[PDB]
Amino acid sequence: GRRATV
Amino acid sequence: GRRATV
Amino acid sequence: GAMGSMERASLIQKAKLAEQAERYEDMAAFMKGAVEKGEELSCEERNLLSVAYKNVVGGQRAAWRVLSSIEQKSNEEGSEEKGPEVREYREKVETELQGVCDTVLGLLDSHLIKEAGDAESRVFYLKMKGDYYRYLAEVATGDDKKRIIDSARSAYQEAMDISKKEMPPTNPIRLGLALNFSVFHYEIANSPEEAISLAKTTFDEAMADLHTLSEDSYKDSTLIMQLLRDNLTLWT
Amino acid sequence: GAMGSMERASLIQKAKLAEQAERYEDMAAFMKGAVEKGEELSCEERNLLSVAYKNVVGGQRAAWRVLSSIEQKSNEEGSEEKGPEVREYREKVETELQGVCDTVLGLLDSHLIKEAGDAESRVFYLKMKGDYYRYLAEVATGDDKKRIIDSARSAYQEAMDISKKEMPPTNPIRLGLALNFSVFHYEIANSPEEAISLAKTTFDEAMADLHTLSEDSYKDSTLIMQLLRDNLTLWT
Ligand SMILES: [Mg+2]
Ligand SMILES: [Mg+2]
Ligand SMILES: [Mg+2]
Ligand SMILES: [Mg+2]
Ligand SMILES: [Mg+2]
Ligand SMILES: [Mg+2]
Ligand SMILES: [Mg+2]
Ligand SMILES: [Mg+2]
């Protein structure tokens, strides 16, 4: 999965 | 489900 | 046109890139530019044009339905008055949607349909004319509603007449035309019995002709036949 | 501004309708109009602004990555020359993306940040400044790349300094700031060890403070803590 940002 | 159109 | 300086082949290449990037507004603008070069469209090019605008107008229609539902609830008994904003914003989306339909109908009238002589192109464009008048009919509420509905009906009926004479019953354009005209009958023209009859007859006549097809054509036809069956299941 | 004639409250109401209709470009335009009224934004309004632009720029960034990958493949040995179209279209998307980032950074500079005195607003806006400089850094290739990267770093670092002094370690803004600054370290600043250290320390300090929270706040904080853990799992 693609790394998370918010 | 919603009826299909194409 | 802002695409007037770009080569036809470059517009087509960029339309395909825009599709891969899911940039459907760009894809539609590139294809409009390609149409305005004045040459007829190949089969692949016609399908790029239709994919682009179907995605653009599909987003607008989905948004319009969300806003229409909110506006309807606002007008029920017991609902607090919230001002003109819901109507105004529904109208803004509606006007944008109508603009896109008018753009597509304008490309068909100037001059895609008049130059389309082969059944596959002519039926394809007349189906598109019916579809975009149908999208106008979905939002129409005034004096012209009946004429908008009749314009959709007339375009679909011409496409049906040509497709029956010139195409096999398994042709995917013929099948999708019938699927959409059946939906027109069901939800625009208040004719559910006609919608069901058309879907059933179209399915059965395609079934009987599958034996003539290659494996790849069989897959193409059965995909749309399943949509006809899905609608019949929903409606019966 | 095209929104100059619309009431602030009507812009906010329409931004919420646009969100429900998934019309994020409209939502962003409405929120830009609301910011330009010159009043400070409430917490809910700040989150409408961020949701709108995050969705707009997120679509642009995803499209840019698709086009960049195609352009990279075109420049490999053995790839047929296809002309300037891929570069041109990647550049078009890139310029649009940079325009949106410049718009957001302009709203922050005129005058959201200078009027933001409470920690929750100031940290939120400085996180946004870091994020939008980071999106500029994702596409930067020229003489200013180092300064763009340093502008992102500086905004994030100020936000971190304030958040550590003024917020609990479970505050969702603090957690999301740390998540994003950690990603900045990993993939912009070539500092994976710093990225991992920040994510781990942020997670552990939040864990130790969960006992102070209500059930609803606990849910808010643990959601972002799971994102920190997801990144740590990806990176180790
Ligand atoms: Mg030429
Ligand atoms: Mg009441
Ligand atoms: Mg109207
Ligand atoms: Mg009956
Ligand atoms: Mg006022
Ligand atoms: Mg070769
Ligand atoms: Mg550039
Ligand atoms: Mg190490």
Numbering used by the authors:
A (entry chain B), B (entry chain B): 590 to 595
C (entry chain A), D (entry chain A): -4 to 231
From the paper:
The hub protein 14-3-3 is an endogenous regulator of various NRs, providing a novel entry point for small molecule modulation of NR activity. In the case of ERα, 14-3-3 binds the phosphorylated penultimate residue T594 in the C-terminal F-domain, thereby reducing E2-dependent transcriptional activity. Exemplified, 14-3-3 binding to the C-terminal F-domain of the estrogen receptor alpha (ERα), and small molecule stabilization of the ERα/14-3-3ζ protein complex by the natural product Fusicoccin A (FC-A), was demonstrated to downregulate ERα-mediated breast cancer proliferation.
We thus introduced double-point mutations (F591R/P592R) within the ERα construct, enabling PKA phosphorylation at T594. The two-point mutations make the ERα C-terminal end closely match with the consensus sequence of known PKA substrates (RRXS/TY), thereby increasing the chances of successful phosphorylation of T594 by PKA. Fluorescence anisotropy binding studies of 14-3-3ζ to peptide mimics of the wild-type (WT) ERα and PKA-responsive ERα sequence confirmed that the PKA-responsive point mutations did not hamper binding of ERα to 14-3-3ζ.
